[PDB]
UniProtKB/Swiss-Prot annotation:
Belongs to the WD repeat WDR91 family. The gene is WDR91. It comes from Homo sapiens. This is WD repeat-containing protein 91. Interacts with WDR81; involved in early to late endosome cargo transport. Interacts with BECN1; negatively regulates the PI3 kinase/PI3K activity associated with endosomal membranes. GO terms for molecular function: phosphatidylinositol 3-kinase inhibitor activity; phosphatidylinositol 3-kinase regulator activity. The chain holds residues 394 to 745 of 747 of the full protein.
Amino acid sequence: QPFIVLGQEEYGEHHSSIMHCRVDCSGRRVASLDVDGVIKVWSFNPIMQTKASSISKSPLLSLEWATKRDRLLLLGSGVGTVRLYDTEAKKNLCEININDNMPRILSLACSPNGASFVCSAAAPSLTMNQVPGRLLLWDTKTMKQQLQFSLDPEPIAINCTAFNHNGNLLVTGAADGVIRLFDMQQHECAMSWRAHYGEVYSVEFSYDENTVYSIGEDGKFIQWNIHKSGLKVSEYSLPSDATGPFVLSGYSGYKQVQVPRGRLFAFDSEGNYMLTCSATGGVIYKLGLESCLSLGGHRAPVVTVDWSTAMDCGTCLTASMDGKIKLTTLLAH
Ligand SMILES: COc1c(C#N)cccc1CC(=O)Nc1ccc2c(c1)CCCN2C(=O)c1ccccc1
């Protein structure tokens, strides 16, 4: 058994389905956001308590902790704005309008070195997610746009972004199923390939950074070789409840339906294990791909996860459509 489960606790302060649930860079705080636009910032070690609690007037689509300034949280709205929120002082330092005509801020990634952030801003969904979008680099010192990257072949909505460890590479996944790797020294697309049939939902660098991992609408987890121009290394069909749509039905003829928006997978510190969503809780696999552990503890579908390691103890966040967030403590035996 590669982990001992030291316990499972529950944060229940949200009354609506969770959209995002992310541990901060210190590994000591969570920022969580539900579909009613309630943000909660809470600690959990050694006990859970709420440090800040606010309700967004604006609809929010994305959430990203700052790297070099621990207590800063970037919030991306659906009305074309980014709020830089100070979790300690419990106030915004600034809001910036990003771009006209592209109001959905679908993704935010703070540079490792703290000096920049990346911003994905998309057009309205059609009245589907096959719509133009832009990927933008912003200077954190001045909170102004540095540049707009090219998106070949055509502008499209980028859903997810992730930096490598030293911030010189950025991997991205788009609503057209395309992955793009950007070199952040020259600030250009180095590499692009068709990764999923349907949307890419999450991307991540492997620990050694020889491959990147994606998960997408076709229900697949795929590992790609970013030395050999995004040739497949390995591929797996996850159960359909790992990628949704996630559905909570009542006996009423009423139901809630959520498509992925927040992270769909998370990794241990060494990138040997991977947490995913399921109807009943988190499911952890060992990366080669075999099932390892089902964490359970949810009465509604899990729609987003996170995994943080500090002090070589793991914390797994699993967040469900009833607003419950489970916190499972893992120590590598
Ligand atoms: C490296 O640290 C990070 C990180 C990280 N890591 C992430 C995101 C931002 C920062 C740095 C940061 O806080 N930048 C920042 C904050 C506020 C303001 C501006 C830039 C320029 C426009 C508006 N503005 C002010 O009105 C203002 C308020 C008080 C004092 C001075 C200016």
